Amino acid sequence: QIQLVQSGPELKKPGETVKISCKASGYMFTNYGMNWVKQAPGKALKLMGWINPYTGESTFADDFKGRFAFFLETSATTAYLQINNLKNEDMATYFCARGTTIVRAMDYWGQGTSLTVSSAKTTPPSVYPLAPGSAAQTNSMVTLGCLVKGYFPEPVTVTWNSGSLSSGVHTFPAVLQSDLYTLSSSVTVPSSPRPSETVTCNVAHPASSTKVDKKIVPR
């Protein structure tokens, strides 16, 4: 019954302000405090603070002063986390979580809200074929790849042979290089079916409505 449904992903530029909602249900919204937690990519959970119930007081960790606010629209049992004057270090995922006073802990957590802060403008990726460079060679299998470079924002969807190829593939998380993202994906197939049987990566970027195919030819 208890549900904490958070608002969708956010894309903002430094200096802007963001409002992340947390819609609660299945419980008496006015009897529990709402906590907010920040988690930077692959890092530990960090408690930002919370907003007491019947009283309406908010506590903030030292790291979250001046630009942060907690408030709620009880008539709709929703809690908000407002971040003004966005900084790059504000980029992370945010969690809303119910607090249970007697135990001094958060019990039910929201699904999480990802926040990206960047001055970069939408940009479709550049897709390059990664075929072997005339060295090494024989054995039972061959690895091929595709470099998806210079796109924004995330994400990108990579498939091989329209998704028919699945077991031999490894698509890696994107990394930021100067306001822009780059990811790579490898596929390993038996050396007998290639180039005999075509192998092509398909890169799609919704953000910019982009769909690109790149057949891997002996480069």
Binding site: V37, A44, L45, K46, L47, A61, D62, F95, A97, V103, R104, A105, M106, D107, Y108, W109, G110, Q111, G112, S126, Y128, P129, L130, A131, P132, G133, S134, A135, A136, T143, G145, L147, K149, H170, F172, P173, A174, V175, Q177, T182, L183, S184, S186, T188, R219
Partner: protein, 216 residues
């Protein structure tokens, strides 16, 4: 502030086996009121953290019998008698005895399997990237185990620790191995200034690094 230190960072286990992880506070968590506010949470890849144990040894509703929390003062332990696949993920301890509640850094419960050397492949800058004025050399070190691996890049026989971006996949669903991608990005001028480009992988499966190179 209360520092919560968890160990290990990664705990490889075989499903069905027992698992035990530690959480230590820089200050005793025993409150003046007698309670010890040390809790545990399970965060699954992509999912919201889940409430597991409260006040040291009390199981939150719905939490399986196999989860047991113990310890006192500054030292705590969370034990899983028989690990199931649903238990894999990152465990976090959290204290709220001392103003400004703090979390431990986490312990990732992963799968143990036999050692596996990485499969390393190097790819020179594509022709269309070059034409466009760019030059990235990519190296794949795939399906290896354990997860600890270091990759070095040498340009004309000398190490380059710059222009390098690395990315790592999560443990593989069907074979429990790990994979890494490392790409050396350099200016086209630079690329056209050197001949040899090598990708060196160091893994416990070998006394000698695995080297993949090409000379343009």
């Amino acid at each position: 502030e209360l520092v919560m230190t968890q160990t290990p960072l990664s705990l490889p286990v075989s499903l069905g086996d027992q698992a035990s992880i530690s959480c230590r506070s820089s200050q005793s968590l025993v409150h003046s009121n007698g309670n010890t506010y040390l809790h545990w949470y399970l965060q699954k890849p992509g999912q919201s953290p889940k409430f597991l144990i409260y006040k040291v040894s009390n199981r939150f509703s719905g939490v399986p019998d196999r989860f047991g929390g113990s310890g006192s003062g500054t030292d705590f332990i969370l034990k899983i008698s028989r690990v199931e696949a649903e238990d894999l993920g990152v465990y976090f301890c959290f204290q709220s005895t001392h103003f400004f509640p703090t979390f431990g850094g986490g312990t990732k419960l992963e799968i143990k399997s036999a050692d596996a050397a990485p499969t390393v492949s190097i790819f020179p800058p594509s022709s269309e990237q070059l034409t466009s004025g760019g030059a990235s050399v990519v190296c794949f070190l795939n399906n290896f185990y354990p997860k600890d691996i270091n990759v070095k890049w040498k340009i004309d026989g000398s190490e380059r620790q710059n222009g390098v971006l690395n990315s790592w996949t999560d443990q593989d669903s069907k074979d429990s191995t790990y994979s890494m991608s490392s790409t050396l990005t350099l200016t086209k001028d630079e690329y056209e200034r050197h001949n040899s480009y090598t990708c060196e992988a160091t893994h416990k499966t070998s006394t000698s690094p695995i080297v993949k190179s090409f000379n343009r």
